[PDB]
């Protein structure tokens, strides 16, 4: 689990 947004 990291940042779940689209980067």
């Amino acid at each position: 689990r990291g940042y779940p947004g689209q980067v």
Epitope: Y3, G5, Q6, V7
Partner: antibody, heavy 116, light 110 residues
């Protein structure tokens, strides 16, 4: 040079709908998510949510998911914010901001005014 | 509750160093809060400065740098310039939502 350019100010009556556009340039539109932010004078910035520009899947803040929806027009590099069944307290400036993580490149803001 | 606090206002002078901080109500800020620093200038001109705690946005001057210090996130401006007079916001990610701090009004003297 990355730019996000939003549509102009809108004034509506309660119960109506508004659509705000956010036109992106200077990068490949579908490689980073687009976030939306609500701001009112002397109140905190509030995160509305994001949309994944590759998959089209949005993620909403709890207080906004009832009436706010995000969409895309991929072929025009446009993200849209749709505010439904407007309330007088939706009166605010709305910003698009590109990921990320978080809020990297910002549109200039769009003032939505809702009458009494 | 997820509340992000910043200093209300700070004053610096040209060429000096100033540190802005961002505190979390839930405990120590970590990498997992993806601290973001954003600058607001007049007429709603917002510019992202730092993402992911310490990653400077391309084209942002290298005098801005992000870190974790003393359970907080920190924006250090090493060699402040007059043009850095602005409101600085920090945003933190709390598992499933972003929260903005209240902003720090930075004044640059002279």
């Amino acid at each position: 040079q990355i730019q996000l350019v939003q549509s102009g100010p809108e004034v509506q009556k309660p119960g109506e709908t508004v659509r705000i556009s956010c036109k992106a340039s200077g990068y490949t539109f579908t490689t980073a998510g687009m976030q939306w932010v609500q701001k009112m004078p002397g109140k905190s910035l509030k995160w509305i949510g994001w949309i994944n520009t590759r998959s089209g899947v949005p993620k909403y803040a709890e207080d906004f998911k009832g009436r706010f929806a995000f969409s895309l027009e991929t072929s025009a590099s446009i993200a849209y914010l749709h505010i439904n069944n407007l309330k007088n307290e939706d009166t605010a400036t709305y910003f698009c901001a590109r990921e990320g993580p978080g809020f990297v490149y910002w549109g200039q803001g769009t003032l939505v005014t809702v009458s009494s | 509750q997820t509340v992000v606090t910043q200093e209300s206002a700070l004053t610096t002078s040209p060429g000096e160093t100033v540190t802005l901080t961002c505190r979390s109500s839930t405990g120590a800020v970590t990498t997992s809060n993806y601290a973001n620093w954003v600058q607001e200038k007049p007429d709603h001109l917002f510019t992202g400065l730092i993402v992911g705690t310490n990653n400077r946005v391309p084209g942002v001057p290298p005098r801005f740098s992000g870190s974790l210090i003393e359970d907080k996130a920190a924006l250090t401006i090493t060699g402040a310039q007059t043009e850095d007079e602005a409101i600085y916001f920090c945003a933190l990610w709390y598992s499933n939502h972003w929260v903005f701090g209240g902003g720090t009004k930075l004044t640059v003297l002279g």
